[PDB]
C-alpha cells in the first residue's frame, strides 16, 4: 500500500488521524511532522526481511522481524523505529544541523529522519531502550549491538528465529 525504506507497508488493522506537530531533535532542530494518532498494525515486506509492526501514537508496541542476516534485520528495525515517530528516535538525531536547508518547496521530515539513521543507527539503538523478555519458542531478543539474546531485547522488538 506504500513503500518506505525499501519495505512495502500494508495497514492490516486499525486507523489513525494526522495532527501537524513541531518536534525538537537531539541536536535542537525543529521538525514539523504529521503525527498519526491511533492504534494500527502494519506488515513490512522487504527483499531480505519481513516484519509485523503494532504501534500506537508515537509508540512502537511490538515489532516481530525475520530476515536473511544481521544487516537485513537491522534495516527493518531502523525503518520501523523511524515509522514509530517515537520521541526517543527524534532525540537520537545528533551531529550536523542537516535538517536545516529549505531549498525545496517541501522536504518530508520522516524521510529526513530515515536518511539520517541510514548513515549510522548507533545512537538510535543505544537510546531506544532494552527490556527483559519472556521465553517464547522461536522468538529471540536482539541487543543494540545486533547480537542475539534469550534474556533481553530492544524494547518491543523480537526476531522470529528457531
Ligand atoms: O508521511 C508521509 O509523507 C509518508 C512517508 C513517511 C512515512 C509514510 C511513508 C512515507 C507516510 N505515508 C503513510 N503513512 C501512514 C501512516 C499510518 N500510520 C502511521 N504512523 C506513522 C507514520 F510515520 C506514518 C503512518 N499511512 C499511510 C501512508 F501513505
Residue numbers in the entry: 322 to 483
Sentences from the paper on this structure:
RdRp of IAV is highly conserved among influenza viruses. It is composed of three subunits–the polymerase acidic protein (PA) with endonuclease activity, the polymerase basic protein 1 (PB1) with polymerase activity and the polymerase basic protein 2 (PB2) containing five-prime cap binding site (CBS). Host five-prime cap binds to the PB2 cap-binding site, then PA cleaves 10–13 nucleotides from the host five-prime cap and PB1 synthesizes viral RNA. One potent inhibitor of the cap-snatching process, pimodivir (VX-787, JNJ-63623872), is a cyclohexyl carboxylic acid analogue inhibitor of host five-prime cap binding to the PB2 subunit. We have crystallized proteins of PB2 wild-type (PB2-WT) and selected mutated forms PB2-H357N, PB2-F404Y and PB2-M431I in complex with pimodivir and obtained four high resolution structures.
Almost every mutated variant occurred only once, but the M431I mutation was found in four volunteer-samples. In this case, 57-fold decrease in sensitivity to pimodivir was measured. The examination of M431I substitution revealed a 12.5-fold reduction in replication compared to the wild-type virus. Compared to WT, the M431I mutant had minor difference in the thermodynamic parameters of pimodivir binding. The inhibitor bound to this mutant with less favorable en-thalpy changes of 0.5 kcal.mol−1 and less favorable entropic contribution of 0.6 kcal.mol−1. The RMDS of main chain atoms, Cß and Cγ for PB2-M431I is 0.12 Å and for PB2-H357N is 0.09 Å. The M431I mutation had only a small impact on the “free” energy of the water molecules. W1 and W4 molecules become even more favorable and the other become less favorable (mainly W4, W6, and W10), which resulted in a decrease of the stabilization energy in the pimodivir:PB2-M431I complex. Pimodivir had comparable binding affinity to WT and M431I variants of PB2 in such a model.
